[PDB]
A paper describes a structure:
Rrm4 is the key RNA-binding protein of the transport process that recognises defined sets of cargo mRNAs via its three N-terminal RRMs. Rrm4 and bound cargo mRNAs are linked to endosomes by Upa1, containing a FYVE zinc finger for interaction with PI3P lipids (phosphatidylinositol 3-phosphate). Here, we demonstrate that a flexible MademoiseLLE (MLLE) domain platform within RNA-binding protein Rrm4 of Ustilago maydis is crucial for endosomal attachment. Our structure/function analysis uncovered three MLLE domains at the C-terminus of Rrm4 with a functionally defined hierarchy.
To verify the structural models further, we expressed and purified an N-terminally truncated version of the Rrm4 carrying the three MLLE domains in Escherichia coli (version H-Rrm4-NT4 carrying an N-terminal hexa-histidine-tag). A complete dataset was collected from a single crystal diffracting to 2.6 Å resolution and a P43212 symmetry. Surprisingly, the unit cell dimensions were small and, with a Matthews coefficient assuming 50% solvent content, only 128 amino acids would fit into the asymmetric unit of the crystal. The structural data indicated that the protein was truncated from both termini during crystallisation, resulting in a shortened version of the H-Rrm4-NT4 protein that formed stable crystals. Both MLLE2Rrm4 copies adopted the same overall fold as seen by the RMSD of 0.29 Å over 59 C-alpha atoms. The MLLE2Rrm4 domain consisted of four helices (designated α2–5) arranged as a right-handed superhelix similar to MLLEUBR5. In comparison to the MLLE domain of PABPC1, the first short helix was absent in both MLLE2Rrm4 and MLLEUBR5 structures. When comparing the obtained crystal structure with the MLLE2 Rrm4 model generated by TopModel, the average RMSD was 0.69 Å over the backbone atoms, close to the uncertainty of the atomic coordinates of the experimental structure. The accessory MLLE2 domain shows variations in the critical region of the predicted PAM2 binding pocket, suggesting a novel mode of interaction with currently unknown interaction partners. Our detailed in vivo analysis revealed that MLLE2 carries out an accessory function for the correct attachment of Rrm4 during endosomal shuttling.
Author numbering: 95 to 160
Amino acid sequence: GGASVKERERLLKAVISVTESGAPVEDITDMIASLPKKDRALALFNPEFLKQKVDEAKDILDITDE
């Protein structure tokens, strides 16, 4: 129902590994950490699911940047 501070930093590392350098990993994490609990746990456990939400977040962050 919102990620703990411990859970949030697990998502941060997880996001960093499937992103390059210079990617907005703090903002991508904020977006994923907002998701329901079953989807957060899925993003720490399935590296391919994580890559799908990291990418579709980083795209919404592009659409919003203009």
